[PDB]
Amino acid sequence: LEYRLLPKPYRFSFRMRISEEIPSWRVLAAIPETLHVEMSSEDVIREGDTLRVKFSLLNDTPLSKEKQVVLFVDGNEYSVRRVVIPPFKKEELVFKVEGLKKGEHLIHTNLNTRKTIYVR
């Protein structure tokens, strides 16, 4: 198993130069490296219901990104998704949160996105 390419998203890059000498393999051209991100949900819900947290990830940069989107609730790691965004492409995700009791609850990621959610 541990030597087989199972059918999931995959990315891959390399640099090529055609020149009279051999350039330093450690040096590369600088490029931007950040994704644009938006989070969005129902700011509220009824005890028992389900919270739907939507995430848009835009990749304006010239390379394939491979990211692990982690959702935290009240500081504790609740869920994670693996994404592969190709260049000049947006990707949308939905997470489903279950079991929130009455009172306010902190929804945040590992992509600098945060939001207080009320439970009537």
- Where on the chain is the footprint of its own copies (CB under 8 A)? 1-19, 24-34, 36, 60-64, 68, 70, 74-75, 77, 80-82, 84, 86-89, 92, 104-108, 110, 114-116
Pick between residue 47 and residue 60 the one whose CB is nearest to its own copies: 60
Query: Which residues does 41 contact at the CB level (< 8 Å), separation at least 6?
Result: 51, 52, 53, 54, 107, 115, 117
Q: Are 41 and 51 in contact (CB under 8 A)?
A: yes
CA angle 29, 10, 67 (to 5 degrees): 70
Pick between residue 92 and residue 98 the one whose CB is nearest to its own copies: 92
Pick between residue 75 and residue 101 the one whose CB is nearest to its own copies: 75
In the complex, the smallest distance separating the C-beta of residue 97 from its own copies, rounded to whole angstroms, is 14
In the complex, the smallest distance separating the C-beta of residue 46 from its own copies, rounded to whole angstroms, is 19
Q: Are 29 and 61 in contact (CB under 8 A)?
A: no
